[PDB]
Design a protein around this ligand. Structure first.
Ligand code: ADP
Ligand code: ADP
Ligand code: ADP
Ligand code: MG
Ligand code: MG
Ligand code: MG
Ligand code: MG
Ligand code: MG
Ligand code: MG
Ligand code: MG
Ligand code: MG
Ligand code: MG
Ligand code: MG
Ligand code: MG
Ligand code: MG
Ligand code: MG
Ligand code: MG
Ligand code: MG
Ligand code: MG
Ligand code: MG
Lengths: 375, 375, 375
């Protein structure tokens, strides 16, 4: 065990399951969210004997299993494979058990009543846990980023948050989520890059969909004004060779997939987009922090990593805004771990320990104990 | 055409615009206020050819469009969609044109100078009209209810009025609006029912927001004493099955939404709510009708529909009050259309015709014609 | 601490609480009169830990709080929040204590019995005071102006007086207050500007009420003959920009808000107003000082700041006058602070020191010590 003060620190997210201890900058435990039921008698029998695969190794051998994930766009839909994922989150990758030792969780800026009582409950159930606390991603992100006032653009394998937060305090009312960040994005990219040609199909040709997007993506300066030249000329569409090898032009997906993060009308939605929200939660925030809110625009996480978005954030927020107000967008592309950083860095501290629930106050009160506790 | 007098009647409101002729009860013209610009080339092209949908069919087909409305919280924010709305509200569903025929409008009890001058103009511009006028909602809503004297609480898709009327006359100086009734209501419900679980999100899961609150909501007798038993038991938060069909426990919103109409310290403001206003407007008024105004509290609009709301009324006007004075609580829940109702009935008469603005007396003195005119 | 004679000076008003020591000009202490219970669990919980805000950092940070004021039109209406106001006023902003040191107060020209006997008990209760006094605003403002014989016109956040003071002496009979200066003013402006347009609504859009009147208000030369060409032309009503940035037009409010001062029929009242008050108290006074009263009209307060008001006095006081007796309106717009100026400068003096109430003679007399004592 480490010297740094005893907590487990587990960031629930939608792409990769991040967990670790107190003190760090990059994740101790990384794994995607999967547990796969194998299925065959005949050839599974014929060839194998052992197993079911989880996360890491399940990236490797997989064409023998049944690959579903168990969490989606937020609160866990079935927490059943989440349980054995958390079993895996504790008992070999870190290796330490939450049985003796204190434990933290992250959460969205504000969580609900009922399932977040049952969140508290599940820790005490299967995992036993003598002390747990649960702290906000946005607030901890901004403390990772070192700051006192900053409106944190979060955006993961699923959700985008836009929290106004002033000297540590997020604001009670200015609340909106975009549920665009990861899947709809990537798997409409699967939809289209497949119609463009080759069945990314069954046993061989599937998770190239998940290599490709990340490498190809700059967010362009404007759309159909490039898509005109694009088609007469031949530049931004690059002929790339994959583990099979036929001439693959990937070309819009680059700017297209994240132009959807701006405006979902490019798949086809009548509803909103990121640009509006960013401003709109500030326009329904507080008048004398509105000021500093536009003037402290910051970002966190996965889908934010993309090159071209400072150029977009300086472009289109100002494109709604008055003549009188002013935006300041702030840059740092370290940001792909900063929630797990914020959790890890805050875990270590003297101050934070007294704020723990002790399991004695669970048994006394119930899981509703969480509703008078975590700040 | 009807036998009953040549006079069109529009009741505008922020939610569903109501209009018709002279004499009726329930509305002749109903629609919700959308036109929304169609957007795609490619898949709009491939599949269709026609359209762009006003109102009616834009609650049938819509996941192609760009769904925005234009009447928000009172005075018209952009009237360009209102113009083509009014081009629907006249030309196809009622069908009968303003060109030869007299026309009437509804409005709040007292209106300003210029954004009512141009309304008088804009009716004579696009729609030409050889005669027109506009009535207050308050009083027509009261003569509808059958009464000479009455403090009516309005509450519809955005606003609440708490309007003191005695013998046909409202009182010249006690004037407060509560800008809550429809949206911050349903859409704060959107916010926290979404955090309770399922991104209600893109093409398929959205307008259950506006189906669910209507059925589920009642006004309860007290709040965090009921939120106590709540979290121990499993009573008042039922499970129901929607167009998809996962277990949706819908729970507080029922009683939490309408409590926010009363005390808006339940999203979290800082800052008023109706219980006060319903009294405040009367404490500010003539001492010899303070009397009867507390003795003649009445109600109108759709957000008024709720079960338990009289129970909330009788409780918490009285609970401010001195030992001396006395509240009556007058019941009528017919009152969902009372504002369109009386404009229909009043359009029928003899008396009201002489009042009409004639196109000639407009052209003479300008759009201020209404300043000296509208009783 | 300063060299100048040990004495605290609270010029209590019903807008911004002000204070300081002796010898000065502009305020040493200024804070708006707000403390205010924050409310929530859940999101308040989630997003902070400490606090409830007084005045200053309330005038910052406020959308989390429960904001009411405790002094209204004149004498305080519950002395509970006024208490923790004075607790702030002494112990952090001046920092000093009324524990060791002598303490002065401000008041209107003469005051009543009971609650001012009690204004001799609260400062000796919690705040202890070994030596105290209270003096008259009107009179102090006139020696602040460096003069002997004046009728001063006050007008602050709520209230207005019309006081003869001749060679130091106010006349014991000539007396009428006006209760229009601050709130009814600004918050009928909120009411009418609200009817004109956009809800000054809930979290973001509410104190642009207070800000807009001050800058925009001139008194004008006459009302409805200006409101004629107002509608026909487009002159006085300016299109600015606020933190929102829609084309807000402010227009009458300028002249109508100070019109309603002189003539409160521009919301709607049956009783009086100012010009006659300013004439009548001198009509009801000694015959041979009438002369010098009408010939020494002088003003102070915040609300007396509006441009045009000089030309208004010189018009509508003299409009009531006979041919024989003559007015002389005196101009100084130094006058936003003049009563506290009155107290601070007068607190220095050797003369005034023998006038103090020692806490010893309070303990002997009880509350009735100020009755014989104060001049
Ligand atoms: N460099 C990058 N470029 C493009 N997309 C990225 C990059 N890094 C991460 N992402 C995207 O971010 C998502 C994962 O972000 P993350 O914040 O880790 O989600 P979570 O916390 O919810 O697990 C993935 O869908 C991934 O494609
Ligand atoms: N049965 C009902 N229960 C609760 N709310 C209702 C009911 N019927 C209508 N409403 C509400 O009434 C509001 C609209 O009322 P209405 O007075 O017609 O508004 P408007 O005149 O401004 O169009 C809506 O926001 C709707 O949810
Ligand atoms: N520049 C100004 N123009 C007009 N009104 C003003 C100005 N400055 C302050 N006021 C008004 O003066 C009032 C407060 O005056 P003040 O004498 O300080 O009141 P108080 O002594 O009772 O605190 C408020 O209604 C405020 O809007
Ligand atoms: Mg995350
Ligand atoms: Mg564009
Ligand atoms: Mg769109
Ligand atoms: Mg708004
Ligand atoms: Mg503010
Ligand atoms: Mg503790
Ligand atoms: Mg209505
Ligand atoms: Mg209550
Ligand atoms: Mg409140
Ligand atoms: Mg009052
Ligand atoms: Mg009376
Ligand atoms: Mg006529
Ligand atoms: Mg004063
Ligand atoms: Mg006049
Ligand atoms: Mg009058
Ligand atoms: Mg005499
Ligand atoms: Mg003495």
């Amino acid at each position: 065990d480490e010297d740094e003060t005893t907590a487990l620190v587990c960031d629930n997210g939608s792409g990769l399951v991040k967990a670790g201890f107190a003190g760090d900058d990059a994740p101790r435990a990384v794994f995607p969210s999967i547990v796969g039921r194998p299925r065959h008698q005949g050839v599974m029998v014929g060839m194998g004997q052992k197993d079911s695969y989880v996360g890491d190794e399940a990236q490797s051998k997989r064409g023998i299993l049944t690959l579903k994930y168990p969490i989606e766009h937020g609160i866990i839909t079935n927490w059943d494979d989440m349980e054995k994922i958390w079993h895996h989150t504790f008992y070999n990758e870190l290796r330490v058990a939450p049985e003796e030792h204190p434990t933290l969780l992250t959460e969205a800026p504000l969580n609900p009543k009922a399932n977040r009582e049952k969140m508290t409950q599940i820790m005490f159930e299967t995992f036993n846990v003598p002390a747990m606390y649960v702290a906000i991603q946005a607030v901890l992100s901004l403390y990772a980023s070192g700051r006192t006032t900053g409106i944190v653009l979060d955006s993961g394998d699923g959700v985008t948050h836009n929290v106004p937060i002033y000297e540590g305090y997020a604001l009670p009312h200015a609340i909106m989520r975009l549920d665009l960040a990861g899947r709809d994005l990537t798997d409409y990219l699967m939809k289209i890059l497949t119609e463009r040609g080759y069945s990314f199909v069954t046993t061989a040709e599937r998770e190239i969909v998940r290599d490709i997007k990340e490498k190809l993506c700059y967010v362009a300066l404007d759309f159909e004004n490039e898509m005109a030249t694009a088609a007469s000329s031949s530049s931004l569409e690059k002929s790339y060779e994959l583990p099979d090898g036929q001439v693959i032009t990937i070309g819009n997906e680059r700017f297209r997939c994240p132009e959807t993060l701006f405006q979902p009308s490019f798949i086809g939605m009548e509803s909103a987009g990121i640009h509006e929200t960013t401003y709109n939660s500030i326009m329904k925030c507080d008048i004398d922090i509105r000021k500093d809110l536009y003037a402290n625009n910051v970002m966190s996480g996965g889908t934010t990593m993309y090159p071209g978005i400072a150029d977009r954030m300086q472009k289109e927020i100002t494109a709604l805004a008055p003549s009188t107000m002013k935006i300041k967008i702030i840059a740092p592309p370290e940001r792909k771990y900063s929630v797990w950083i914020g959790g890890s860095i805050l875990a270590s501290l003297s101050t934070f320990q007294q704020m723990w629930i002790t399991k004695q106050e669970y048994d006394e009160a119930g899981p509703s104990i969480v509703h008078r506790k975590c700040f």
